[PDB]
Ligand binder design. Sequence first.
Ligand SMILES: [Mg+2]
Ligand SMILES: [Mg+2]
Ligand SMILES: [Mg+2]
Ligand SMILES: [Mg+2]
Ligand SMILES: [Mg+2]
Ligand SMILES: [Mg+2]
Ligand SMILES: [Mg+2]
Ligand SMILES: [Mg+2]
Ligand SMILES: [Mg+2]
Ligand SMILES: [Mg+2]
Ligand SMILES: [Mg+2]
Ligand SMILES: [Mg+2]
Lengths: 327, 327, 327, 327, 327, 327
Amino acid sequence: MNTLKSLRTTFLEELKSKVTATEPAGLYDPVHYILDLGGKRLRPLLTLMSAEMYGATAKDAMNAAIAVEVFHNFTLLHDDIMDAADLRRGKETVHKKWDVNTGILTGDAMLIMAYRLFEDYDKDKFYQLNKVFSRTALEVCEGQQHDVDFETRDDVSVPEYLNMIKLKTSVLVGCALQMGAIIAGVDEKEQELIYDYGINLGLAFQLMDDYLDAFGDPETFGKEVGGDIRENKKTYLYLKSIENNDCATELKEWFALHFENMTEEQIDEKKETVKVFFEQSGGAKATLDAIESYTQKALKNIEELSIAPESKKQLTDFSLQLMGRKS
Amino acid sequence: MNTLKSLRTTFLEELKSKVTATEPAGLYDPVHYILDLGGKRLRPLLTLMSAEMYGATAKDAMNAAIAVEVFHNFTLLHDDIMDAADLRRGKETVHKKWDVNTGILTGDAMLIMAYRLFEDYDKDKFYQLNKVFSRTALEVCEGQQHDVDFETRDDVSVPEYLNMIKLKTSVLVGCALQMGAIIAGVDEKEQELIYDYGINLGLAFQLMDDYLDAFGDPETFGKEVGGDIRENKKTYLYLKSIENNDCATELKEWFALHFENMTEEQIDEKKETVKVFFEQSGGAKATLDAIESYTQKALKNIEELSIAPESKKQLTDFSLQLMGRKS
Amino acid sequence: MNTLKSLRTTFLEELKSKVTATEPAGLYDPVHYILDLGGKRLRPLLTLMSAEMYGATAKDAMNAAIAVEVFHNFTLLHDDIMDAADLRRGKETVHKKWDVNTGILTGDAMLIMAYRLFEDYDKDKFYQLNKVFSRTALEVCEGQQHDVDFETRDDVSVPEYLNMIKLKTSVLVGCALQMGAIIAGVDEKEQELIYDYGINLGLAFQLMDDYLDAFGDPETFGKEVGGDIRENKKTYLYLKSIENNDCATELKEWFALHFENMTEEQIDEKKETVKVFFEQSGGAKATLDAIESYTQKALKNIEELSIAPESKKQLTDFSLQLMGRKS
Amino acid sequence: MNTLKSLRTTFLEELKSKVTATEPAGLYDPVHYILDLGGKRLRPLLTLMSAEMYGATAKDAMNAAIAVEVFHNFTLLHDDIMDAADLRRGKETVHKKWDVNTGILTGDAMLIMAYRLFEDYDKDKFYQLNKVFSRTALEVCEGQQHDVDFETRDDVSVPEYLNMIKLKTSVLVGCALQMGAIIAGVDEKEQELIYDYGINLGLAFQLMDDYLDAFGDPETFGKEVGGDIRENKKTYLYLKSIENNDCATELKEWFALHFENMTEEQIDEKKETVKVFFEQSGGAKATLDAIESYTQKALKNIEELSIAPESKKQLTDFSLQLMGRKS
Amino acid sequence: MNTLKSLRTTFLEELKSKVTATEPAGLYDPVHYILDLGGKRLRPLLTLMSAEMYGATAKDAMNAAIAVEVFHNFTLLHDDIMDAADLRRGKETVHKKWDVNTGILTGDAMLIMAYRLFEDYDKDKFYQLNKVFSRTALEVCEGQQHDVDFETRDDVSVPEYLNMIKLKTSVLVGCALQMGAIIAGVDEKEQELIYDYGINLGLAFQLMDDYLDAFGDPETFGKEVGGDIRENKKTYLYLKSIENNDCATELKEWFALHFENMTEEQIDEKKETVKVFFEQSGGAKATLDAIESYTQKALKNIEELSIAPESKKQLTDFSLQLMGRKS
Amino acid sequence: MNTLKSLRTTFLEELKSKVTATEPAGLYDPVHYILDLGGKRLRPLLTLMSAEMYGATAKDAMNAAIAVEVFHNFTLLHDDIMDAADLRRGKETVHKKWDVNTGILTGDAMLIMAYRLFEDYDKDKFYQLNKVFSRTALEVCEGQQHDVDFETRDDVSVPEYLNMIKLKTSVLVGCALQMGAIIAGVDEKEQELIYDYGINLGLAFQLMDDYLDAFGDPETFGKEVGGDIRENKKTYLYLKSIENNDCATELKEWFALHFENMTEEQIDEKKETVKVFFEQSGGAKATLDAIESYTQKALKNIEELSIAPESKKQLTDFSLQLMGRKS
Ligand SMILES: [Mg+2]
Ligand SMILES: [Mg+2]
Ligand SMILES: [Mg+2]
Ligand SMILES: [Mg+2]
Ligand SMILES: [Mg+2]
Ligand SMILES: [Mg+2]
Ligand SMILES: [Mg+2]
Ligand SMILES: [Mg+2]
Ligand SMILES: [Mg+2]
Ligand SMILES: [Mg+2]
Ligand SMILES: [Mg+2]
Ligand SMILES: [Mg+2]
């Protein structure tokens, strides 16, 4: 496959070229805004990489890659509204810069624009793309609802948590890879194998996000360190920490304090104290083990793909780099 | 074609049978709720009527008919949020019964469920259905944004108003008819002719809604009489009324008072006084003329369709009944 | 027994004489205010009537009678806060005239002042008075909590409703009568018999309040007609109405609309429509039957009391007058 | 007397055993919650110590000791509502964890449960317990109202401040000791002597709390340092500081700034600057002198009690330990 | 003097000609808006009438007449903000159409523009105009503050009420007349005589407004009937009504209910009931007597002015017409 | 001229003596409060200095000097309301200590009191004082509106910014000097020359305030460092910084974040980062150059005044000291 940097450069050129709606501005200005917040564009690049590895061009896969990115950004726009997020990537969220009604309607327009980007494909690929895309989009809705339901549950199991993050953050990784495979004309059995890789990669990636939310390096315009702790989100780190009967009661008591009932200094003490319980309980290590375990499962999936050994080496290195390890 | 009553009965059976997602309840309970608020189901029945007239069965068109209804209800769910509507058809809106975040996410899930209802069609019809559906859905978003933009404009032309209501309320009428024609295997030229009928019908229907909002018979759990007046919506009735230099200045002055700066009795006096200006200006008659004119255009479209004369008589009668006239 | 009018006159003299705390004004001004809102003073007069019937004087029972009234008013003060009531007996509630913190603290001071009014009794009666008073006060708290719990339950049984109104409104009727009996030196078996009368009377009285809330004559500064309907309170009238499978579904649908999602006219239509369902279902008649049935049970209790036949005739007439019937 | 640690251990066992109401949970769950927030339980242990010193057992005094603690916690529950406190002892307040209406009603239920804990005593002690308890409870209400009244007064005298803290925080110390003496069968003259000790101890203790609010060691989940300063509470420390005509004008000017008109850094500068004025004015020393003076008065009261010299040594040491001094 | 209608016509021409500032629009657009709300322009026309009667022209007095109107409108702009008025003369208030900050700043600009309209006068008249204008403007501020102070007083005397309405509404009537006299070159003794007429006229006019607020004919876009009653304003009508010991207690009790604690129907019942107390107490008649009495005092002032008997007849008729009587 | 310190001492004596209105307290208490917040009283002292330099006494100019200070404080009172300022000079703003309505009405009373302080001047000076005062006051209103208009403009030129700060902060400096010259009997040509000095001085002074807002030394009860940055005020520092095409895009992006969408730490990072862009762009130096340039223009104006060379040396030194330079 081409280098990430080469694919990203082509991708950002083709994005500007294929997303051109401008009028009415009240609808489309926020689409250009959210697509211009930058970053790694991991999801669309999985589509291009999959395509190349299986014999097609980036150029062939490009409209589908752009659908994936438009879709993902549609989810961020509605999610920022539902989560009352003020900033995304150091910039105002769409509903803050404009208004909530703009966020609702523009996000709706982006989901539809994503579907439209499939229309240049032949009838057979068009059908296959729409089918895995729609199943994935509806799964992402279910994952969102599960995550909301967990907010008022005091009894969430690790299996239920892994099912939720699979639907909410991993199926679209699978889907992005599967779409490149569809464009290359690969069969269903092969499509499912690359999909499965995407599931294990996506689960490792999200478990890593759970870990770094608590233990990650602070960035002022980056993700707040200890946001999950402050908001009492029951992530893999917390769920594993409370399996230890020594820490469980005083972890549950920290997770009973709302941040609106607390001063800055109380919130910071809660983050330092809960971080220490995460280490001492074995929860932090159990989280690093689960990330390691999903990454290995993803590497074994790569070994079984019908792609050239170069392609497996590139994918194996990309997977290790994504998980902050070295090649 | 079968009778409306026969099609509606089959439609409500097939709706219950084909929309079965139940878990998670936080996502899908509101889908069953909004689909159970009743009424005429005009849009899906246009799909079934189109199908029958051109040779297919209701049963063949049914999944597409249900897509149309799921789509329309998705738009009502987001619209009720954006318009802060408390009631729909005498019952609490989804965002009032549940919450705004439920309305946002459930509406997203309904748009995706609509797309999925195309999946049993052959690859050729699947392609055609998705294409006219997506273009229609994005047009409905544009119409919504235009209607929002008109709120802060003091200078809206009749042409701009007719373009907005075409996108917001008529293209989906066209689309519902065009989808039945696609299922019957009709060609693009014929599909566009039935689409065009739907445009003229949909414009007549919406101009009728503008008229009845001011002059309609009061229903307590029905549409408020004078809601457009209270909210200073610049509808066809107002736009034509202000063409009269005798009424224009004191109509613009009534339309400058926000209802939040007014007592009940002031609002009622504003409605009675503006209603009288609508009559005396010629605006009310000009609105009835435009409804009459669009209805005639729709009747001429029916005369040119490639359908049996029975089918034209049934459609001609359905069009007159819809516009509160007699056969 | 003396006439109600004679007892009430003595009672209001002794009230002014025995509740004299004035400083600090921020605490005690609201006590004088709430005790001066007038009405029938039913509860304290039951204490005086019980005392006389069993051989003691009004004067002997007076401090205990005043405790009962101070207690009852303490409950109204906290209840007006918890129910967000703006007016009581045509005048501002304590928390509206002053503030919520005044309502909380003054109500606390009134409960304690009630207990103190027992202190002139001999050690034996003091003990008995405190014991039935405290059990009654804690039962009234439980009844309040049950009524709150019923707000979020869709499944309340008639037995659970009768248990709630017994605790919330009837045990204090029983208690007021039992306290007069204690002051007259009557034994526990007799005390319980008059208590039981008070339970049946209190249940009849509250079932009558449920009936008149819907069907009572309007008083502008009196209880709103249809308040229970507007607030979707599941009272005996509603619980019996929904036993009719013909009315049940559209009663439950009316009871799903919050009044904050409705206009005045929608609220008035809901009250007229639900009132009609109450009649047509058999719920209204079943409510009048239950009032009749509790009143008869109370009359039989009177026949078994150890009091002079005069005393039974006076009590029998008082019971019928209270229930808006004739002697 | 037994050791504090031994009495506390027995007390927490007997508390769990004698406070068993669980249904309805909406009423009683918050009672178990507030009684489980831990700490020294000073007030109930004064009751047990008094009992032992005068010849009775802890076991005899236990129900009365538990009444004292239930009473005190009832006051904290209403006080946390009226003061808008978010946390108590590092945990959410009842009105934050549940709601305000829960706090109002559960607190009412706790006052009544306290009264009920007297019922196992003989009629003579029952009478005496209820009488000093009720007088104390009503005095605590008056002290609360005085403290509220001082918020809008610019003219509060040291005598008026000492009278307020006596009613609000000291009479219950007196009362707790007096109740143990009543259970031991001691006479009124002796009961008043131990009561008086409790008054002087309670005044020393509260003057110490005034001192430590400004000058105490910071605890993140403990009492905020400088809360009285931030809220402009006119405590003994401020009242003595303004007797100095050199500091008075700029102290009154600091005490004119609301914390809602200030940034964190302004609040911290106000606390550092006012703390310095407290030292330099002589106010801090005058506060330490008043604590010393009340402690000595309490020690002289101990010398005059009719108890064994051991008992006086234990009480003398307990008094010095409470005031953060050594034996 | 010219007819009111002739003076008003010249006045509205000269207003448009002499108030021409347009940029920046954010400052001056609201000046044109508030000056275009129409009505009788009584105050400026008093200036023109005074001028003519004493020998000058309307044209000479015009800039001063316009100052008076600009001043009066400046007071209405700030008053509408402070009173939270939504409408003025059937149109949105400046702070509702724009914002509060616009109302504050534009009103400030209008006071200054008023002062500037004196600048074409000779140095002697300029001095005299500025002096009576400034004293009047500061008196109007004092009257406003007194009216605010009366809101929290339960003890307002008729003398204090008459002093307040003199400052708030009458001194500017006096001032407008005095300014015309200054322009005609009249001496101080004569200027004070016409001023005094204006005081008695202005007091009659305001007492009439107090009367008509309760008893006036309803106009939907006019002054609310019973606004003073709803807002518990202690006007001459209420102050005289409570002199009757028969009505006083239940009038004070009606005047204790805030309209925010009341339903529409309670407010309407309060207005009907208080109106009846106003009649039956003698308060309504005492108000008509005071209006009659001030009008007669004004007529006697006219008899003593140094003007032609025509001028006295015109002024006498104008005074009677203003008070809704006939010539 | 006398020393600043000598003039300030006389000024504060004469202020206390000439501003004596006390009743009603609700109107005048806030006038005494805002005039007692201290500082340099630059503006009134310019009036006294101008008077002395041209031959009059301080005593002659004093009433006009006090008008200037009363006027300036009137503007601060309304400005603190419109800007929602909580503190002024370390003390609560008038609208926070009292209320907004007090701020509106008291500020109105202060503008009128200012005008009244001209009344002891002879008719010729009275006329000249009123005329330059009123033109200045109306210009200050226009400058305020321009500054408000700039909040919603993305396109503000340096010329438009300099025009706004001239009207908002410099014309009153000119005016204060011109009034002293009028009192000394100087001619219009000379009056305009001292006015012009005041314009250049006032522009230098305000450009210095723009500079020190970003780069000034922090004072806790002083002006917040980086307030203009936090509020995205487009001051000379920002306008010059964005002329550099290297910094412009990321400066505009920082200036797009509202502080309500940011944490403390994000605000502090924004201030540090924007401060660095101000230096590196050349904007900071260009601001120091413009201050230097206006100061030199002011020094040249001093050289051309018709005053004694002493007077020019004193004024030259005062100008350099004001701009934080040395003599
Ligand atoms: Mg994200
Ligand atoms: Mg997540
Ligand atoms: Mg609709
Ligand atoms: Mg519409
Ligand atoms: Mg009641
Ligand atoms: Mg009830
Ligand atoms: Mg505490
Ligand atoms: Mg305290
Ligand atoms: Mg008016
Ligand atoms: Mg008035
Ligand atoms: Mg300033
Ligand atoms: Mg500025």
